[PDB]
Amino acid sequence: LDVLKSTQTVIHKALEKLGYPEEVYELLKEPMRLLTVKIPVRMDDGSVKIFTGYRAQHNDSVGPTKGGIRFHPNVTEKEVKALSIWMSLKCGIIDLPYGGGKGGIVCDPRDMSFRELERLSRGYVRAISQIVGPTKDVPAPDVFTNSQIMAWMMDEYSRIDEFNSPGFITGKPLVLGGSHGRESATAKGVTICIKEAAKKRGIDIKGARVVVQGFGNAGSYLAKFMHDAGAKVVGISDAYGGLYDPEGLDIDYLLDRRDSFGTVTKLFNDTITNQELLELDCDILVPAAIENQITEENAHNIRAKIVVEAANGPTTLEGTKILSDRDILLVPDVLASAGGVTVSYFEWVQNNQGFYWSEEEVEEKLEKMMVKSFNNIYEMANNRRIDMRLAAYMVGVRKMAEASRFRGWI
Amino acid sequence: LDVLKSTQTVIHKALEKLGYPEEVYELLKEPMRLLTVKIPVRMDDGSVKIFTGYRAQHNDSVGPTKGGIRFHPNVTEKEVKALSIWMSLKCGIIDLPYGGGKGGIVCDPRDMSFRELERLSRGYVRAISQIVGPTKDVPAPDVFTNSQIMAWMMDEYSRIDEFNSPGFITGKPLVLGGSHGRESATAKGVTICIKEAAKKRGIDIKGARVVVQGFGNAGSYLAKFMHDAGAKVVGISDAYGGLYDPEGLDIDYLLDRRDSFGTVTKLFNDTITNQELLELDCDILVPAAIENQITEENAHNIRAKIVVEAANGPTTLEGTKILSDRDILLVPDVLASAGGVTVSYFEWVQNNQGFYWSEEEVEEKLEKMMVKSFNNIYEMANNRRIDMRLAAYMVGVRKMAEASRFRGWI
Amino acid sequence: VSKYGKSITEGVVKVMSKMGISTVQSYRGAQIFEAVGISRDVIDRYFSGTASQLGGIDLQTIAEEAQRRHREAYQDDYSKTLEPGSDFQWRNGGEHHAFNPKTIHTLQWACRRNDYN
C-alpha cells in the first residue's frame, strides 16, 4: 500500500534483473537530500502563519535534479521521496541529463489568496535557495501550481542571485522564457507512443478501431488527434457512464468549445448503456478514467491488440502479466506521460542557450526523443523476454546506477 | 521519546510567562531548516555503507547557528531538533550572537575505524556543505567526536571552498586555530556560578565545604579551582566510590595520583557510595556525573545549601520542587555547563580576527560573561517568584523572539 | 562492575604477592606460570621460557578442544539452562572427584568394620 515501499520494491526488482549488487539499491532507494523548512507568511488579515515545506533530491550523478512542486495539504515526506524517485525514473527513461527531484508545501490554495500565494512561493524559494539553482535543482509546476507561481519563484530567485535566472525554474510564461507545446505535451506523447506501437506491430492507422476510457481533457484531445486518420468504436467513463457507444461509428469533430461541466458534448440526457462497456474487437485501447480499472477478473475479457496507459496505475501486476502472456502490447504510463518532462527539459535548454525554438522544432525533437526511448525499451524487453513496464524501469535505473558507479559512490 | 515534546512544553511556558503571543511559539517549536542526507562510505574491507545524517538549524535571526555533531547509533530527527533548541537556549542565556544547531550521524564509532571515521566525517561535511559555513552554521564536537574529527571537517570545508576556513568549525587543535581553556571551560563556569551563588546567599567561599560527585576532567578541575579559592573539598567520587574528610582531602595529592580516567581510590580501602555521598554535610554540592540522582527520597536527606547541576539533568521535577520548598539554591545545567559553548564562541571570534588570545584573557572574558548571565537570571527569578530553570529558559527565548519580531518573521 | 574490577585487581595483586612481585609492570613481562600438558614445541613457539616437564598436547588438540566446546555450545538445542559445575563440588555426570560419595562411604564402612574386601 505504501507508495514509497512500492517504489523501493520496483527499483529493487529492476536492479536485480539488471544484475547489480545490493549497495546500488541501498543508495537509490532513499534520496540523498531531504530538506524540511518552515515558511512564515503574513496573511491578509495581519496574522502570521507557519507553512511546512519539503524538498527531496534523489541523485545528482547524472545531472541537476528536476522536480515539480505541488501545493496540497496531504503532501508528506514519503510521498515527496517517492515522487522524486519516479521523476528520476522518467528522466532516465527519456535519457535526460537530469536527476530525481520533488517539492511540496502543506497548504490549501483554494483558501489562500493571490497575495498570500505569492508570499508563500517567495518564502519557499528563500528557504530552499541554498540547495537549488539552474545547476543544482530545477523546480517545475504540479497540481495546484501554475505559471504565475513559477514566475513569482523566478523573480525571487533572480532577486536573490542578483541576475536573471530563467533556467532555474521551468513552466514559465512565454514572455519570461517559456516554451511552446507545454499544454499539449502529454497528449502528444501518448499520440507518438500509439503511432510507434502501431508501426512496430502490423496495425495501420487508417482503420484503427480505438476504445477510450477518457473523453475528458486528455482523452478528448487524443480522440480528436486519432480521428484524422483512425476510427472509433466506443467511448467509456465520461464522468457519467457509457454515454458514448457508436459501436463501429465515428464522432464529428466537437473540440471547438465544449466541456464536461455542462453535459459532455451535446446533451446529458442522451441514451446511456452502462458504466463499464469495454470488450469489443478493437485494435487500440486507451484506459484513463480511474486508478486500477483493470483487474484479474476482467484481464482476459479485453480484446484489444494494443493498450496504451494514459493515467496513473490503471493496471495491476496480474493484469500486466496476463496481457504479456496474451501477447498484447502494453505501453507503461511512466513512458506515455513523459511529454511534460521532455518539454520542461526543452524549456531549460532554451533558457541555457538564450535561443527559443518554435512549435515545429519542439514537436520534432519530442518525436525523436520519445521514439528513441520507445525503441530502446521495446528492444530491451524483447531481448530479456520481459514486460514493457519492467523494461522501462530497468532503462530508467540503468543510467543512475552507471553514473553512480562511474563517479565512485558505490 | 518525549524529549521534543518536553522542550516544546518548556518553550511554551517560558513564552507564556514572558507574555509573547502564540505565533512566536509556533515559529520556535520546530527548526526552520532540517536536512537529511545519505553518506556513502568506503570501508576497509572494500564494501560501501550508507550512513544517515541529520542537520537541524533552529533559528538564524540572532546570527549564524551554532551546534554540535555526535556519532551515535541512537540519533534521531526528534533528538536533533530538541538539542538544537537547547543549544539556542544556551546561546540566548549567555547572550551570544548565535542560533541553535545540531548535527548527528547514525553510526557506531566503536566498530568503525580511524580511516572509516575520517571518510564519514568528510562525507557528512560534503553533504551539509550547501547550508553550513563560518557565516551560516558552526559545528562543534559531541558524543564520540574530538579535535581530530573537527580537523578532518575543517580540512574538508577548506578543500571545498578553496581557502582555509578555521571559523567554520570549532573544537579544533591549537595548531589549526584552537583556543586555550577548551578543557577547563565547564569546570571554570561551574566555579564562577558557585562563587556567585555563594555571594548571593552570604556563604563565604573561604572554608566553604564542597562535595563533588564525579572526578572526571570537569570534577578534577572544579576541585582544583575550589582548593585554590580556599574552599575545602570534603568529598569526591569516581567510578569505584567516594571519599570523605571534613577537614580537607588533599586535592593536590589526589590530582597527582589521578590517572587518565580519573580514578583516585585505593584498592584495599572501603569507599563511600554516591547515595550517601550526596547526603553528606556540605554547603556546596556539585553533581557532574550520571543523571537521575536526586529524587524524592534523597531530596529531604540532602544537606547542601547550594546545588549546581554540572552534568545534564541530574535532578528531577520532584527534587527541584522539594529543594525549592527547603530553600536550597539550585543552579541549572543549562547555565552551569555553558563554559564549553562560551569557549567555542571565543575560538570563533579568534578565527574571525586572526588573533588568538591567552589563558588569562579567556578566563576573564568567561568570568564576565557567566557572571552577567547568572546575575540576570537571579534578578529575574527574584523579581518573579519562579525557579532559576524557568528564568533561564525565559532569558534564552527572549532574545530569539525579539530578533524574529524585529526582522519581521512574525 | 566497579566491585568486580576492584576484587579482580586485588586477586591479581595477591597472585603477584605469592611470588613476591610487588608491581604489575614487572609481573606482566614475567611468566610466573608453569604448563602441565603442553608440548615443548608449542611452548617454544609461543610460550618461550615456560616450563613443561612432560610436554603434552599440541596446537591441533587445543584447536580441537576449543572447536568442540564452541560447537556443542552453539548447537545445544535441548535446554535453556547452564549445566552445573563440578570444579569445587561433585555432581552426578560431572568431572571426576577422587573423594566421590562411593569411595567415601566404602572407606568409612571398611574402617568401621575392620573389614578387608
Next chain:
Amino acid sequence: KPTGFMEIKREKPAERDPLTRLKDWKEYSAPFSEEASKRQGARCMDCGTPFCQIGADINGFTSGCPIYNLIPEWNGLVYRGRWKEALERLLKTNNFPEFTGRVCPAPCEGSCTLAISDPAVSIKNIERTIIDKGFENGWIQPRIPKKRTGKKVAIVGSGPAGLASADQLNQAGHSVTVFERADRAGGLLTYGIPNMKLEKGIVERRIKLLTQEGIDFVTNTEIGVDITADELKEQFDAVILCTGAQKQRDLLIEGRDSKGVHYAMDYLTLATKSYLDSNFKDKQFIDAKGKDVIVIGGGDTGADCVATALRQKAKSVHQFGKHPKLPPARTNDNMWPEQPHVFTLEYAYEEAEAKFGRDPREYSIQTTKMVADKNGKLKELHTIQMEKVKNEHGKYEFRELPGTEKVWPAQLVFIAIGFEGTEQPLLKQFGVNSVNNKISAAYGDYQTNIDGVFAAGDARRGQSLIVWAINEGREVAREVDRYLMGSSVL
C-alpha cells in the same frame, strides 16, 4: 555461614485427619506454604558432594535421586524465594515432577548428609510445592518444538518411561506414537497407584499437555493380535519396548482355589476404573465393606489395598508379612548412606489405627499363611508363625513354629508377595530374549537382539520406581536418537 540445619526443626505441611480422610478419595497431603518451604530449604547446607544426588544401588537398595536432581540448587532458590528459576532447574532433569513430589519414597532424604543425627530436609515436599506453584501460576506450557524431522519411534506402553521417552523424542523433533491397552493412558500411575496418593486429574492434564505437544497417544490396543511386530517394524524405524512389569507371582499351595481370591492389581484397577467412570456405582469391582480382608505380602501394593479397603469400610482388614518388623532406629550394619530400614508408619496404617477402636492394631508379622479353607466362598484363613534363623554358613532361613497354629476370618484375600517380569512368553512376536522374565538389556546401550528395538523401564529393570522409569526412558530416548541420526544431545 548458614546455620539452618542447627536453628530450624523439620516440619510437615497440612495433612487431613486420618479419621475423616476415609470419607473421600482425594489427596492425603498438601504442599508447603511459602514461609514453611523457605524455612525447610534453609536447612539444606548446599551439600559438598551431595549424597542426595548419587542415584545408585547400594547394598541392593537405591540411594539418592536416580535422575540426578539439582536438589541443593532449587533448595537454595526456594530459600531465596526464586520459584521460576527453581522450577526451570527442576525441569532440567525431571519432566514429571508432579508425580514424584507425592509418590516417590524419597531415598534422597534417607541418603543425605543431614540425615546423620538429625532429620533430613523435606526434598519431596519441596519438589511438590515447586511444581504445584508452577502449575497454579501457569508457567508450564507446551514447548511446541519448531524443528520436526520426519521420524517415527512408536513407543509401546504409556508408563512413565514411555511418557518420558515420548517427550524427549518429541523435543528432539521425532513424531512418536504411544500405544496403550487400557482406555486411560498413564501406565501404573493411572491405575496401579491409588487416586488417594495421586489423583488422576494431574495425570490426565499431563497427557493433555503431551498431546498438545504432538505425542498422539492411541489407546485400546494390545499391539498383539491387533497389531503385529512385522508391520510395526515395516511402518516404523524404531519401536522401543516400554512394556513394564505386571506379571505377578503366585503361591503353588493347596487351598488357593476357593472363590474369593483376586489379584491386588486387578482389584485396584477395577476400583479406580469404577471410581473414574461412575464413582464406584456401576458395581463392576470387588467390595468388602461387610467382608473381612486379608492382604498377604507387604509393600506399596499392600498399603494401597489396605487403604482401599479402609475407604470401602471393610469390617476387618489385616496385613501379613513374613519378614520381621523394622526397628525404630538404624542398626550397626545400616548407617546413613544406605537406605534406612526403620519403622515408617506410612499411610493406610495410621488411618486404620485411628479408626479401629475395638482392634486398634495392624501389621501382623512373621506369618504369611498356609492351607486355606474350601467348599465355595472363603470361610477362614490359616496362619503359622515363621522365624528367621542362621543355618549352614550364617544364611537367613525361615523356620515354622508348630506351636503357633492360629486361624483368622477371611472372606476376601489379596496376594501382593511380589512381582514377575514383563508379559512373556505371551508377547513372543519379537525375537527379544529373556532370562528371568526380564528382556535382555543393559543399562546404557539398550539395543536388543533385533535392530530398531530397545528395552526400557521395569520390563528390563525388574521392579523399580517411577523415577527409575523416567531415568531409563531418558537414556533410551538419547540412545535411539543417536542411532537414528548419529548424534543426540539428550
